[PDB]
Scaffold this active site. Structure first.
Site, mmCIF file in Angstrom:
data_model
loop_
_atom_site.group_PDB
_atom_site.id
_atom_site.type_symbol
_atom_site.label_atom_id
_atom_site.label_comp_id
_atom_site.label_asym_id
_atom_site.label_seq_id
_atom_site.Cartn_x
_atom_site.Cartn_y
_atom_site.Cartn_z
ATOM 1 N N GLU A 1 -103.097 69.837 31.552
ATOM 2 C CA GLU A 1 -104.583 70.430 31.357
ATOM 3 C C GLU A 1 -105.461 69.328 31.590
ATOM 4 O O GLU A 1 -105.217 68.070 31.257
ATOM 5 C CB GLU A 1 -104.575 70.999 30.077
ATOM 6 C CG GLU A 1 -106.048 71.506 29.701
ATOM 7 C CD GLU A 1 -106.207 72.069 28.165
ATOM 8 O OE1 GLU A 1 -105.064 72.072 27.390
ATOM 9 O OE2 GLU A 1 -107.101 72.346 28.094
ATOM 10 N N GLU B 1 -100.976 53.872 33.129
ATOM 11 C CA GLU B 1 -101.977 53.726 32.159
ATOM 12 C C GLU B 1 -103.185 54.391 32.729
ATOM 13 O O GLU B 1 -103.376 54.310 34.010
ATOM 14 C CB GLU B 1 -102.169 52.522 31.732
ATOM 15 C CG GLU B 1 -103.328 52.348 30.687
ATOM 16 C CD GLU B 1 -103.586 50.944 30.010
ATOM 17 O OE1 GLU B 1 -103.983 49.902 30.892
ATOM 18 O OE2 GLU B 1 -103.407 50.673 28.886
ATOM 19 N N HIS C 1 -97.916 71.334 25.911
ATOM 20 C CA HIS C 1 -98.693 70.906 27.234
ATOM 21 C C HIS C 1 -99.297 69.712 26.866
ATOM 22 O O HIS C 1 -99.473 69.382 25.687
ATOM 23 C CB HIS C 1 -99.615 72.048 27.511
ATOM 24 C CG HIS C 1 -100.837 72.598 26.918
ATOM 25 N ND1 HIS C 1 -100.440 73.475 26.096
ATOM 26 C CD2 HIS C 1 -102.086 72.201 26.950
ATOM 27 C CE1 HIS C 1 -101.794 73.822 25.583
ATOM 28 N NE2 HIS C 1 -102.604 72.855 26.087
ATOM 29 N N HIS D 1 -97.465 56.378 23.101
ATOM 30 C CA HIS D 1 -97.386 56.625 24.454
ATOM 31 C C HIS D 1 -96.646 57.871 24.542
ATOM 32 O O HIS D 1 -96.145 58.384 23.695
ATOM 33 C CB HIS D 1 -96.434 55.482 25.120
ATOM 34 C CG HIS D 1 -94.850 55.253 24.573
ATOM 35 N ND1 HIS D 1 -94.778 54.304 23.397
ATOM 36 C CD2 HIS D 1 -93.630 55.554 24.709
ATOM 37 C CE1 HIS D 1 -93.276 54.380 23.198
ATOM 38 N NE2 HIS D 1 -92.918 55.134 24.145
HETATM 39 K K LIG Z 1 -110.445 75.456 27.163
HETATM 40 MN MN LIG Z 2 -104.582 72.508 25.572
HETATM 41 MN MN LIG Z 3 -90.667 55.837 23.650
#
Ligand SMILES: [K+]
Ligand SMILES: [Mn+2]
Ligand SMILES: [Mn+2]
Ligand SMILES: [K+]
Lengths: 134, 134
Positions: free
Chosen positions: B110, B41, B64, B7
């Site tokens: 992203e 989720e 990221h 997670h």
């Molecule tokens: K890319």
């Molecule tokens: Mn990336």
């Molecule tokens: Mn945790």
């Protein structure tokens, strides 16, 4: 429409130390290394390490990254990392075994037994304050 | 011993704003909420939001979190989030379409088309500096 997690990228001040930690200590496979980063894989997880000069690590909050582990391997994993001098950042109090440790930059990691459904099931019996399920 | 990603947990200063962002703009399903957090989720990804009211977001570095998206959905997603007013933090320069956007706290996200194998294949044909494979 998003499909799930594609990759995790971590800033790292010492790319050699970080590769050694994820590969040699945690068992990630190194797939590529270049002068400003690395690509590693653990199961389906694509991890990128991005060399970040003078990076001092994150500040103190609960942002963290949890990796799965089988119940039968938990104790031996925690013992191994303790014996290797890894620093812990949290003592477990929630459902499922968890070992909470820092990476070389201070990113917050976890090794955890269980999944979202095991957590939801335990929380329905022992809920957090104000907890609501949907 | 570790098996993959279990997670991801993100610190959030404004739990209602972050739930709305992840649920309504990114299409996560809200599975539970409580006074100090939420579980969501997306595919197999378990996201936790941890309420931290004085959290100021991360400092600027390349840490990221990338989510997958199919080629055919990419342009619509990018256009949708731009129309909403989401802020971008990078312009794509690497293999595979990517849209780089900030969440309400400034966590770097992203949406990416491709995977580690497509990235390695493109890199084998055109390596980054000092690049070596493993
Ligand atoms: K890319
Ligand atoms: Mn990336
Ligand atoms: Mn945790
Ligand atoms: K736990």
């Amino acid at each position: 429409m998003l499909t799930g997690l594609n990759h995790l990228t971590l800033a790292v001040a010492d790319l050699p130390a970080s590769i050694a930690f994820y590969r040699d200590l945690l068992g990630f496979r190194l797939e590529a290394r270049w002068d400003q980063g690395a690509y590693l894989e653990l199961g389906s997880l694509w991890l990128c390490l991005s060399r970040e000069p003078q990076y001092g690590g994150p500040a103190a909050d609960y942002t963290h990254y949890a990796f799965g582990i089988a119940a039968a391997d938990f104790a031996r994993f925690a013992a191994q990392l303790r014996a290797h001098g890894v620093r812990e950042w949290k003592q477990n109090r929630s459902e499922g075994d968890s070992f909470y440790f820092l990476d070389p930059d201070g990113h917050r990691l976890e090794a955890h037994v269980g999944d979202l459904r095991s957590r939801l099931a335990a929380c329905r019996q022992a809920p957090y304050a104000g907890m609501r399920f949907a």
